[PDB]
Amino acid sequence: STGSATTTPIDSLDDAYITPVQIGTPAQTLNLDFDTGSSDLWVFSSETTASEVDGQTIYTPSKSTTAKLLSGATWSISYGDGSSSSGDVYTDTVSVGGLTVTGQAVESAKKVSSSFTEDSTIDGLLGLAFSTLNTVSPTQQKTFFDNAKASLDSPVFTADLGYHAPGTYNFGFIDTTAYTGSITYTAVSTKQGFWEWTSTGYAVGSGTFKSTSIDGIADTGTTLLYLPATVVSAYWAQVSGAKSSSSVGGYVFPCSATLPSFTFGVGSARIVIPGDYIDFGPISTGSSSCFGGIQSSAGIGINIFGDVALKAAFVVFNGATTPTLGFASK
């Protein structure tokens, strides 16, 4: 089997992407944030504290003839941005782009932090990291990908995120029309539960490539590109007037600037992030100071190849017995 679903930016800045997911019988369609940096599929629901729901679409398990409470199961999760959610668990039928999993753990939010409440466009998350990170207790649950894997024509999914435009998540096949040149595959460590790999270096604009190993995770659920402070300093030093602002929380730059591209290495291959991808607009409405799309990972504890980087590529998440990551230009 295969699946193919369109993923759509939630706003003009590509702060995140939502992908429609059918849950239950009859289908309830929720728009979820596909997140290769986590492993819980959780949804706003009929169980979510009412004051914590503000415009999201909710999953109502009582209206699904295939929903079954997973007795005793709870979940609780915190993300790198400090947001969190928690609740209980049903199993139900979940389909993505024509691909169907029966008995998928659907984690029903009883509580969500303000960040989620304040974002009316995201009805939940669908984790695509490794199931070892799944927070369901006392019985850890599998991701949608993990549950689908055996049925898929090939044990892969791909992320083709658009820049200010819709893109595509495919399950079980590689769309050879979706990228240019070849796909360069690179080794993955699953030791921390993530799609963790090692970039072979970087360049800033038309500058020479710096060969250097950068360990990081391929994380569709993170907006920006988080890299070591040395790298990020090298990048912003090429932008007149750019500075790190503690008050704002990262590198800002004059909105009047033209940003240079950023290249990262995948083995011998190179992915170029156009400068425009790195502009996340005014720090506040009307401000002439703009927020940078490349930020320091210092104090995160890990480098994150978030959407800024991934949207510049066609990315293959290869869940073979030995998982690997593939990157192609597009």
UniProtKB/Swiss-Prot annotation:
Peptidase A1 domain span: 17-328
GO terms, biological process: proteolysis
Disulfide bonds: 255-290
Catalytic activity: Hydrolysis of proteins with specificity similar to that of pepsin A, prefers hydrophobic residues at P1 and P1', but does not cleave 14-Ala-|-Leu-15 in the B chain of insulin or Z-Glu-Tyr. Clots milk
Organism, as annotated: Cryphonectria parasitica
Active site location: 35, 199
Keywords from the named record: Aspartyl protease, Disulfide bond, Hydrolase, Protease, Signal, Zymogen
Family: Belongs to the peptidase A1 family.
EC number: 3.4.23.22
Protein name per its UniProtKB record: Endothiapepsin
Keyword ATP-binding among record annotations: no
GO molecular function: aspartic-type endopeptidase activity
